[PDB]
């Protein structure tokens, strides 16, 4: 109504581990490429080069 309710962008990790004294441990990592192309054209004129 006027009571704005927000959404969030989150990065959360909940891990159980065991390590030695002073060692560095990675508990999460991500690589995430994304791509999308859309074309509209006329039937024969669209394919003329340039």
């Amino acid at each position: 109504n006027g009571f704005t309710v927000p959404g969030f962008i989150t990065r959360r990790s909940n891990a159980e581990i065991n390590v030695g004294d002073g060692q560095t441990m990675v508990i999460s990592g991500l690589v995430n490429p994304k791509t999308a192309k859309n074309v509209s054209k006329l039937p024969w004129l669209g394919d003329i080069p340039i």
Binding site: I17, N18, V19, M25, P43
Partner: protein, 50 residues
Amino acid sequence: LATPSPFDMEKMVWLDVNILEIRKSVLENFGVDWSKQIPGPFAAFGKDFV
């Protein structure tokens, strides 16, 4: 008189996950679309005998 350890050091496991997805689509709409229902002929008669 022996005592246990506070906990047991367990083996650590690294998990690597890959998710690959590809989508392709084509859409075409071509031709001439005519009318399929048109009015037909009409006839009417009317008379006053008396």
